Design an enzyme around this catalytic site. Structure first.
Site, PDB file in Angstrom:
ATOM      1  N   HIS A  40       0.802  -1.218   0.000  1.00 19.75           N
ATOM      2  CA  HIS A  40       0.000   0.000   0.000  1.00 19.75           C
ATOM      3  C   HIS A  40       0.850   1.291   0.000  1.00 19.75           C
ATOM      4  CE1 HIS A  40       0.078   0.154   4.560  1.00 19.75           C
ATOM      5  NE2 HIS A  40      -0.059   1.451   4.335  1.00 19.75           N
ATOM      6  N   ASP A  84       0.045  -7.603   1.714  1.00 17.84           N
ATOM      7  CA  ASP A  84       0.491  -6.207   1.751  1.00 17.84           C
ATOM      8  C   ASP A  84       1.985  -6.126   1.917  1.00 17.84           C
ATOM      9  OD1 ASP A  84       0.485  -3.470   1.727  1.00 17.84           O
ATOM     10  OD2 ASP A  84      -0.363  -3.231   3.761  1.00 17.84           O
ATOM     11  N   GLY A 175       1.835   6.825   8.633  1.00 15.69           N
ATOM     12  CA  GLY A 175       3.216   7.237   8.402  1.00 15.69           C
ATOM     13  C   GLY A 175       4.235   6.215   8.874  1.00 15.69           C
ATOM     14  N   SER A 177       3.469   3.027   8.200  1.00 19.36           N
ATOM     15  CA  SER A 177       3.176   2.038   7.160  1.00 19.36           C
ATOM     16  C   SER A 177       4.407   1.580   6.431  1.00 19.36           C
ATOM     17  CB  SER A 177       2.247   2.662   6.054  1.00 19.36           C
ATOM     18  OG  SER A 177       0.975   2.880   6.547  1.00 19.36           O
ATOM     19  N   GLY A 178       4.528   0.274   6.234  1.00 22.71           N
ATOM     20  CA  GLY A 178       5.648  -0.252   5.516  1.00 22.71           C
ATOM     21  C   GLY A 178       6.854  -0.582   6.365  1.00 22.71           C
TER      22      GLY A 178
END
Ligand SMILES: [Ca+2]
Length: 223
Positions: A40, A84, A175, A177-178
């Site tokens: 994402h 994801d 923020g 994320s990942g």
């Protein structure tokens, strides 16, 4: 990261910031050439920033390297967030030393109760908004599959796990994320999704990296 602590500069040496004019996602360095992040987080024109603490100040340990190619998982579904995960190749190899280092991939899946370290530059508030400049950290346990499914009926796949605190107050957030979830020196999770941040009965949901090791290795071997 809500309810965490200031990590300390370069204490999380595999943490990267993905930058497209601004920080927008975290990621994890898994070898000199490759970063793991969330699907994402995909966009074109990514610069990977390694060696960061304050993302708004050049402090002396940074390496900024443009991505040459991004590979979203073949089965990523952006509606459900199943699968994801995304790989990002660097145009040039990072220089590795103790402040910039890869993180090992798991050889086994982690169990509920295992303690992990989650990190990032995301929002530090559960209501409203404050983005830190320096890297934040949170120690949190993996939750049981049953508690995770009970928290998010109909939404948790075999490629996801929950981690954090059902009481609320401590979680990853927008923020982050990942970015990484590291347990006993292995990358076991990727910050993926949740309902708000740090809400009661709504823990963080993370991509279950151990399911992807085969794909990661084969993809690196041919790209
Ligand atoms: Ca910096």
């Amino acid at each position: 990261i809500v309810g965490g602590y200031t990590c300390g500069a370069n204490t999380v040496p595999y943490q990267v910031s993905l930058n497209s004019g601004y920080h927008f996602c975290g990621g994890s360095l898994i070898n000199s050439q490759w970063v793991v992040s969330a699907a994402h987080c995909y966009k074109s024109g990514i610069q990977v920033r390694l060696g960061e603490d304050n993302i708004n100040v050049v402090e002396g340990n940074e390496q900024f390297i443009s991505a040459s190619k991004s590979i979203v998982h073949p089965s990523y579904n952006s509606n459900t967030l199943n699968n994801d995960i995304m790989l990002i190749k660097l145009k040039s190899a990072a220089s590795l030393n103790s402040r910039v280092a890869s993180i090992s991939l798991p050889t086994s899946c982690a169990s509920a109760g295992t303690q992990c370290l989650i990190s990032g530059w995301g929002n530090t508030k559960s209501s409203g908004t404050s983005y830190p400049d320096v890297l934040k950290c949170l120690k949190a346990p993996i939750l049981s599959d049953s508690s995770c499914k009970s928290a998010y009926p109909g939404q948790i796949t075999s490629n996801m796990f929950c981690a954090g605190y059902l009481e609320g107050g401590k979680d990853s957030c927008q923020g982050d994320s990942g970015g990484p979830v590291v347990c006993s020196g292995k990358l076991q999770g990727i910050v993926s999704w949740g309902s708000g941040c740090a809400q009661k009965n709504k823990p963080g949901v993370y991509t279950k990296v151990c399911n992807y090791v085969s794909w990661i290795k084969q993809t690196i071997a041919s790209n």
